[PDB]
Amino acid sequence: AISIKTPEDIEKMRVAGRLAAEVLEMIEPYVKPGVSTGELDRICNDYIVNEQHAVSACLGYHGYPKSVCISINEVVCHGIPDDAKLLKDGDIVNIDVTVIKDGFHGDTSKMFIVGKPTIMGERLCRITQESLYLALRMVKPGINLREIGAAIQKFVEAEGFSVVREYCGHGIGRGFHEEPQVLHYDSRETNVVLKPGMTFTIEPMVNAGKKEIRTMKDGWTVKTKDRSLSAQYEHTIVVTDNGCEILTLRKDDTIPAIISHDE
Numbered sequence: 001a002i003s004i005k006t007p008e009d010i011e012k013m014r015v016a017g018r019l020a021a022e023v024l025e026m027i028e029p030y031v032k033p034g035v036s037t038g039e040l041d042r043i044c045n046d047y048i049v050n051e052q053h054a055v056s057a058c059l060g061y062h063g064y065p066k067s068v069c070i071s072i073n074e075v076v077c078h079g080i081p082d083d084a085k086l087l088k089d090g091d092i093v094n095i096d097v098t099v100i101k102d103g104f105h106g107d108t109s110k111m112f113i114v115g116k117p118t119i120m121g122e123r124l125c126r127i128t129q130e131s132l133y134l135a136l137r138m139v140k141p142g143i144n145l146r147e148i149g150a151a152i153q154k155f156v157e158a159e160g161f162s163v164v165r166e167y168c169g170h171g172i173g174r175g176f177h178e179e180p181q182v183l184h185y186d187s188r189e190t191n192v193v194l195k196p197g198m199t200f201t202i203e204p205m206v207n208a209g210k211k212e213i214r215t216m217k218d219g220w221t222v223k224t225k226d227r228s229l230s231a232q233y234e235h236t237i238v239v240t241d242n243g244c245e246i247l248t249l250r251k252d253d254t255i256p257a258i259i260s261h262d263e
């Protein structure tokens with residue numbers, strides 16, 4: 001029961017996506033060594049609310065206590081903005097912003113690397129993003145979700161990394177999570193054939209080591225089961241008549257906003 005967004009609806013996604021991508025533009029300057037994840041959440045929430053005049057879709061969603069998730073190193077997802085957590089040299093850092101504005105969600109996230117990169121997180125972060133872009137490039141009317149998922153996996157495995165299975169991109173709209181599920185791997189289960197006007201996310205979680213994850217005592221923080229690094233990027237898109245438009249693109253992104261397969 002995939003909604004097909006209207007024109008007016010799609011225009012609201014664009015706004016909401018820009019909003020969400022703008023939070024992540026805003027925050028980069030403040031992503032330095034010595035800063036606290038607790039501090040960043042403070043910063044993004046103030047902005048979301050006061051400046052952007054939007055709400056976090058994070059906050060109180062299943063009891064989520066903070067306004068953005070911010071995962072570090074071997075934290076895979078849903079890390080908790082913690083006033084005592086500080087960023088060190090060498091850290092790979094995901095911050096996931098999801099925003100509602102005028103009743104539509106925008107949902108995006110990115111890796112920041114902090115101070116002096118290391119070769120390994122410099123790399124895992126690169127593949128992770130290329131595995132998103134690869135997939136972004138496949139989206140068009142009549143392709144199957146299954147193809148996309150299979151493709152992300154191969155890319156990712158060929159580099160000696162694994163795709164986290166527990167999480168998936170998703171339908172998005174008036175709801176955070178809508179059909180379809182966007183698995184980032186192959187499944188006889190998946191058989192979705194895309195149509196002009198579906199909105200959804202692509203957001204592969206990629207581990208440097210093995211694909212097994214583990215939730216912490218706090219009920220929230222997911223880690224690598226082998227403490228290997230993990231990394232994620234996410235975008236929201238609309239399928240178009242000839243391809244896709246990416247609705248949460250940033251100035252720092254290197255793929256076009258509009259993507260066409262037509263002649």
Ligand SMILES: N=C1N=NC(N)=C1/N=N/c1ccccc1C(F)(F)F
Pocket residue numbers: 057058059061062064069078096098107167168169170203
């Ligand atoms: N699937 C997701 N893509 N972006 C997000 N923020 C996603 N999920 N967030 C979840 C999922 C379950 C429970 C709580 C959250 C929260 F709060 F981080 F948003």
Ligand SMILES: [Co+2]
Pocket residue numbers: 096097098107108109234
């Ligand atoms: Co997100």
Ligand SMILES: [Co+2]
Pocket residue numbers: 107108169170201203234
């Ligand atoms: Co998402």
Ligand code: NA
Pocket residue numbers: 071072073074075076092094229230231
């Ligand atoms: Na991580």
